[PDB]
Every structure is written in C-alpha cells, then in structure tokens.
Design a protein around this ligand. Structure first.
Ligand SMILES: Cc1c(C(=O)O)oc2ccccc12
Length: 284
C-alpha cells in the first residue's frame, strides 16, 4: 500500500502495536559473540543491546578492537551510517578513535547528557574553547572551536588532532536537544528541519566516511533518524515514489543492527516524518 493512506488505515483501526510486533517477529537474528566476551562487559551500556559480529566497527588496535557500534550500509540509497551507543566513561577515547579511523565528518547526538534524572551518556566533548580534552588511552586531542545554540538544536565545530601524527581534522557536532523525556514529538517539523541541516553540511555525503549517530542505546531515536533519511532519498531516486515501503526499509536496516525503532510510537512518528518530508522536498 501507499504510505499516507496505510497510515490513516492503521490510525483508524488502532493497530500500531500489532504492526510493530510483526516487524519484531520478522527481524534478523545474527550472532554477537564478541560483544558478550567477559573482557567487554564495561564497554556495553545495556546487556540486551549489542552489535552483530558481521557488521560491527573494529578499532585499529591489536589489544582489544571492540566498540558497541554498527555499520548500516544501504545499497540502493547509496548511504551508510554508523549507529552507536552513547559513550561511557571508559569508552570516550574509543569513540573518538572510531571517528578518526572511519574518516567521519559529522556526529549526530539525539539525547541530552541527563534525562529522567539519570546519566544517559558521558560528557564526551569540551564545553569551553580554552579547556580542551586529551584522551590518553588513544592519543587524541579535542578542542571546541565554535558553538551555535538554536531553539531545537545546537551545532558545534570541533578540532580533532591525532597526537601521534599531528594531523588535524574539523568535525561537526549536530545536537538535537528537544526530544521529550517520554514519548515522541507531537510534530515532526523540528526533527525534519534538523535532518536537513545535517544534510546541508556535507556530513552524509560520499566524499566523507559514514556519519556517526547515537542516542543512549543507539537503536531508538537513532533508528528514526536513519530510517527517515533513507526513505526520503529513495523517494527522490525512484520513478515511482509511492513504491517506497517503510516497513521493508526498516527490516533491511535491522539486518545490520538489532532493535532499530524501540516502540510503536516511534514507528508511527517515523511514518509521520517521511509523509511530511515528502511534501517539502517538492518539488514543493
Ligand atoms: C505521487 C506520490 C505519491 C502518491 O501517489 O501518494 O507518494 C509519493 C511519494 C513521493 C513522491 C511522489 C509521490
């Protein structure tokens, strides 16, 4: 079926939970043996969220190459994403090592450091220009260059230096600051505006490594971001945009990381975002 009328048909029939449970039943199951090794317990935020072995990102290190991060490679859309958990106190150096080694331009953050009164990720970037961060375990230096605070999101320019080689690179940090503690946003307008700002920066383009996107577990809000981006790109590429099937795209992405889209409310929100976004693209 088309999307916008499939949408009204699920709303009127109140069957979002059943649609979402079907997706959960059909999703891929692949091994995640490296994630479960005892030496990696303090590298995982949640025991039930792990990268598959076949798609996990490897650190260029001979001691322990493990990070909780997955490569999502979308062949028809010609887009790739790295989805990862919010960094932990003992993985902030690994996180920036990955950014460096994978040649990423941008980092997309969809959570606040504290939500619901608890810490959802480490403070992994510097908050003042004159107070830089040094990660001694991976030999990197990170400096805040500029910060632009808007009503729904903040963009930061960061400088990452590999202290072994003295090479430097500019990284863009895109921080969506207004996702509610409970539920999903009422309108997708600010989330779509944010997606378009990431696109306009070059961070999603083939001349760079894959964008790094995270929330707390790296599967819920993060899944919503890449699902909406990929669906909108397919609608622009194909002769028949109404052939884009959001449930089929989601099952393809779940071949590369488990659990993408965590609730039936997130599924409904993803439909809403793609529907509204397809009107703004046109040709309108
Ligand atoms: C014409 C059209 C429809 C439709 O027939 O509903 O859905 C789309 C999505 C993207 C671009 C064009 C379309």
């Amino acid at each position: 079926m088309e999307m916008e009328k499939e949408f009204e048909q699920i709303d009127k029939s109140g069957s979002w939970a059943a649609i979402y449970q079907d997706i959960r039943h059909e999703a891929s199951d692949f091994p995640s043996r490296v994630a479960k090794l005892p030496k990696n317990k303090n590298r995982n935020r949640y025991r039930d969220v792990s990268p598959f072995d076949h798609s996990r990102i490897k650190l260029h290190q001979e001691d322990n190459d493990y990070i909780n991060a997955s490569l999502i490679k979308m062949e028809e859309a010609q887009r790739s994403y790295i989805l990862t958990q919010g960094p932990l106190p003992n993985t902030v150096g690994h996180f920036w090592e990955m950014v460096w080694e994978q040649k990423s331009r941008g980092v997309v953050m969809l959570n606040r450091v504290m939500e619901k009164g608890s810490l959802k990720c480490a403070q992994y970037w510097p908050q003042k220009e004159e107070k830089e961060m040094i990660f001694e375990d991976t030999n990197l230096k990170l400096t805040l260059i500029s910060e632009d605070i808007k009503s729904y999101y903040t963009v930061r320019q960061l400088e990452l230096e590999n202290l072994t080689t003295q090479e430097t690179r500019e990284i863009l940090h895109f921080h969506y600051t207004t996702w509610p503690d409970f539920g999903v946003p009422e309108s997708p307008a600010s989330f779509l505006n944010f997606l378009f700002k990431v696109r306009e920066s070059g961070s999603l383009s083939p001349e760079h490594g894959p964008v790094v996107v995270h929330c707390s577990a790296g599967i819920g809000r993060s899944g919503t971001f890449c699902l909406a981006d990929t669906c909108l790109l397919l609608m622009d590429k194909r002769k028949d945009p109404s052939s884009v099937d959001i449930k089929k795209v989601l099952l393809e992405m779940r071949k590369f990381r488990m659990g993408l889209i965590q609730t039936a409310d997130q599924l409904r929100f993803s439909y809403l975002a793609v529907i509204e976004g397809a009107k703004f693209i046109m040709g309108d």
